[PDB]
């Protein structure tokens, strides 16, 4: 699901004018918002204006600095990494998000266009083929776990 959430986030960053994709991407499990937060964001127009302005800033960082600066500014401003680490069972989700971010940054340097990385991510979502780099890693090594 994290690849689909990253695809929704990249579609909301690339096209922030249409509010439907932004509203579908903000309510994902990566942001960590309740239904009351989404309702108050849809009711207050000024909060949605601030959201559209900061997503346009994220798009400017994505066009000027790259993929990983935009994702690091998103994880630092929204503070979703601390919320995923405080959540029980979210460390695997955070490691998968970081691995998807590393793969998107590796595939985004070879493509000059900005929509081409989104099309490559949608293609790799639609292609379930397993490479040596595109597999799941170990989530933690410090905590002892039962190894299957």
């Amino acid at each position: 699901l994290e690849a689909q959430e990253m695809l929704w986030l990249l579609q909301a960053v690339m096209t922030p004018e249409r509010e439907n994709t932004l509203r579908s991407a903000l309510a994902t499990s990566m942001m960590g918002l309740n239904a009351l937060d989404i309702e108050t964001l849809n009711n207050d127009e000024h909060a949605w204006d601030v959201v559209v302005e900061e997503f346009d800033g994220y798009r400017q960082i994505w066009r000027k600095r790259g993929v990983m600066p935009m994702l690091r500014a998103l994880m630092s401003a929204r503070n979703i990494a601390e919320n995923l680490l405080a959540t029980a069972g979210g460390e695997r989700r955070l490691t998968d998000i970081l691995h998807i971010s590393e793969l998107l940054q590796e595939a985004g340097t070879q493509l000059e266009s900005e929509h081409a990385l989104v099309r490559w991510l949608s293609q790799h979502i639609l292609e379930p083929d397993s490479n040596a780099s595109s597999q799941q890693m170990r989530l933690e090594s410090d905590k002892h776990l039962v190894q299957i």
Partner: protein, 713 residues
């Protein structure tokens, strides 16, 4: 200075970690000695145009060429035109093959369909004739492209025709005196001159004329094939490297270049593990210099060892060496290079720590090699990096994540204020009871998760499965319910390419006609002509306005080519409640495949209004809180626990285990059937099916889905 063994593998990670720093943390960087990639959508498109007779002419390979703005602006195709052409290629059945002669050239039988010429004829027939008229030359028209937007089809047909001509142009082998105007004519035909892409086309022409001049300098007389020139141009275009920003003032990122030693204060080395460095180049085997070495001979291994020596000598103040020691995949030990191993062996044998003055030789060497080795953590949010001491992380963004002082993820279910309106339509109730969580998402908070459409397949459909088979079965059932000619619908579906080619499409149509005739023997056995009527109801001060289609005096008759499911039973029960509440004495029947039948007897108006008030209360409860009523798994649990003979639910442990087994079977399906738990609407609420939420879904299904199995017969 920072030197890597391979610059192209590490340079994305270097750019990622150097760009992501904030304004107080940002240091300027300059990456040199990379492979020159000036404009990849121009060079890769020209390489794909040079591979035109060898290409299979797949639809994705032409849409990737149309993704290039130069090739799209040459034939006056906009981005909106490309977005329309995506679904125009995907829906009209264009899979592979430009012409039928291209299919016959590849030693394949001429099918006549699923090609670019077939799709072009289909789109032009749709521009000329509506799809409801029928076939003209065994080609069904395409009713989408009808107005002036089909002029963009006239641009696409302007492209593929050119893709025929060079396909007949680049096939024959030509001598080097004839390949001169070919690249120029290809560039002025397929590409348009622009301000940005002028230098790329100039470099392409310069490299092509340089290859032709180097070939004609030797006065080559024989013919030269196209693939050799394509591979030579692909090798020569990626041969360039840029080093203009090598010492501009920002920190230098470059690979190890031989015979270049510059003194620096801080010298960092990356990728010093074994296998990567030293870069080993295998000899040709028939070279005579490798057999008898002399004094002035040069090899890449000795050059890399001398580069490591020059990096050791050239370091003035600080020397940093980092290598991959642990595998990120399987946590396997990755040994470093032999140069770094000899360096740490000389360090351990030539130096000792003042804590252990005279202990041993091997133990002091191991203690020095363990003190110098800083085994960093696997993840950046580990609290070991932020421990105060010798080393401490400078990442301020990961400080509250490593401190573990943040709030956890709260539950998405929250009590929201909702006022039930006066006029609630029947379509809203049908969309609610079709999927309650989806109606809570896409209508209350207006969050509809938009999934991207599937890609175009690389081959023609040999079998029928999924949405296409369901649409074919639905049209065949709608044709056989009026006793129409099934052979005309067979020719209509074969003229569009949705059927398999030859006898297999006839076999599929015969077995689907047999199944739909077996269903229609039960459907039209009790079918009466009925018209659509209006519904205006007032329940608990709530107005329900709508329309019911095909209302016969026998009752309600619905037919769908699906399986026995609880959602269609809920829809039929809602239609029966909205039908029996205003007159209408009679049963309600729905006939599915494999002898599936949902029947509800006629009930009184008071019980119908009571159940309608219960459904209205469930609708107003589903808008405030997410109503956890699973139709399929909850109905399976209920019908495992329900007993229609005694009209009471069993409470023994064997039924409580069989209901849990059926719930786990219906929630998470097998490897062939997509289960109910594999859904984007259910994974947002919970990630793992807890037994408390399972019992909550069980209680909600016992509260709501109970008249589905109570009045079933």
């Amino acid at each position: 200075i920072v030197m890597v063994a391979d610059i192209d593998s590490y340079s994305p990670f270097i750019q990622a970690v150097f760009g992501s720093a904030p304004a107080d943390r940002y240091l300027p960087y300059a990456i040199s000695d990379r492979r020159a990639r000036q404009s990849h959508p121009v060079l890769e498109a020209f390489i794909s145009l040079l591979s035109l007779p060898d290409s299979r002419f797949v639809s994705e390979d032409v849409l990737a060429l149309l993704d290039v703005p130069v090739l799209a602006a040459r034939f006056d195709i906009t981005e909106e035109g490309l977005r329309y052409l995506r679904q125009w290629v995907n829906e009209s059945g264009i899979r592979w093959g430009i012409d039928d002669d291209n299919v016959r050239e590849l030693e394949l039988p001429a099918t006549g369909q699923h090609t670019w010429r077939f799709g072009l004829t289909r789109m032009l027939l749709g521009y000329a004739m509506e799809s409801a008229q029928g076939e003209w030359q065994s080609v069904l028209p395409y009713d989408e492209s009808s107005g002036l937007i089909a002029e963009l089809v006239g641009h696409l047909a302007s492209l593929l025709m050119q893709l025929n001509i060079w396909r007949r142009g680049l096939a024959q082998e030509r001598p080097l005196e004839e390949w001169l105007p070919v690249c120029r004519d290809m560039l002025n035909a397929f590409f348009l001159p622009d301000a940005e892409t002028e230098a790329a086309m100039t470099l392409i022409e310069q490299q092509w004329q340089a290859i032709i001049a180097e070939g004609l300098g030797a006065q080559y007389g024989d013919a030269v094939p196209l693939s050799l020139l394509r591979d030579e141009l692909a090798q020569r275009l990626d041969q360039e490297r840029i080093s203009q920003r090598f010492l501009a003032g920002p920190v230098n990122i470059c690979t190890l270049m031989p015979m270049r030693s510059i003194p620096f204060k801080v010298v960092c080395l990356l990728g010093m593990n074994d296998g990567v460095y030293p870069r080993q180049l295998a000899p040709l085997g028939f070279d005579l210099m490798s057999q008898k070495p002399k004094r002035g001979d040069r090899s890449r291994r000795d050059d890399d060892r001398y580069l490591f020596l020059e990096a050791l000598i050239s370091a003035q103040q600080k020397l940093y060496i980092s290598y991959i020691g642990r595998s990120i995949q399987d946590n396997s030990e990755r040994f470093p290079s032999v140069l770094v191993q000899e360096l740490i062996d000389y360090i351990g044998q030539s130096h000792y720590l003042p804590g252990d003055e005279a202990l041993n030789c091997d133990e002091s060497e191991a203690r020095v090699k363990a003190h110098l080795t800083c085994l960093h953590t696997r993840m950046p949010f580990d609290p070991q990096n932020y421990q105060p001491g010798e080393r401490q992380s400078y990442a301020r963004e990961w400080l509250p994540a490593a401190s573990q002082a943040g709030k956890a993820h709260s539950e998405f279910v929250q009590p929201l204020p909702f006022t039930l309106p006066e006029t609630v339509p029947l379509e809203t109730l049908q969309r609610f009871w079709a999927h309650p969580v989806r109606a809570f998402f896409q209508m209350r908070l207006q969050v509809n998760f938009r999934t991207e459409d599937s890609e175009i397949p690389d081959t023609e459909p040999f079998i029928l499965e999924g949405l296409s088979r369901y649409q074919i079965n639905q049209q065949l059932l709608n044709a056989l319910v009026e006793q129409d000619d099934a052979e005309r619908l067979f020719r209509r579906f074969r003229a569009a390419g949705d059927l398999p080619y030859g006898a297999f499409g006839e076999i599929f149509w015969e077995t689907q006609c047999q199944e739909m005739q077996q269903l229609a023997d039960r459907v039209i056995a009790c079918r009466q002509p009925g018209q659509s009527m209006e519904i205006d109801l007032a329940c608990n001060g709530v107005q329900i306005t709508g329309w019911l289609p095909q209302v016969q005096p026998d009752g309600l008759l619905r037919w769908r080519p699906s399986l026995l499911s609880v959602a269609q039973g809920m829809q039929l029960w809602l239609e029966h409640l909205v039908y029996c509440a205003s007159g209408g004495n009679g049963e309600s029947r729905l006939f599915l495949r494999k002898d599936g039948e949902w029947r509800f007897p006629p009930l009184a108006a008071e019980q119908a209004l009571h159940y309608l008030s219960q459904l209205i209360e469930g609708y107003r409860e589903g808008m405030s809180a997410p109503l956890l009523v699973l139709p399929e798994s909850g109905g399976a649990w209920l019908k495992t626990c329900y007993d229609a003979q005694n009209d009471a639910m069993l409470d023994d442990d064997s039924t409580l285990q069989k209901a849990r087994t059926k719930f786990l079977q219906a929630y998470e399906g097998n490897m062939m059937v997509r289960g109910e738990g594999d859904d984007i609407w259910y994974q947002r609420l919970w990630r793992q099916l807890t037994p408390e939420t399972m019992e909550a879904i069980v209680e909600q299904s016992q509260r709501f889905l109970l008249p589905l199995f109570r009045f079933n017969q």
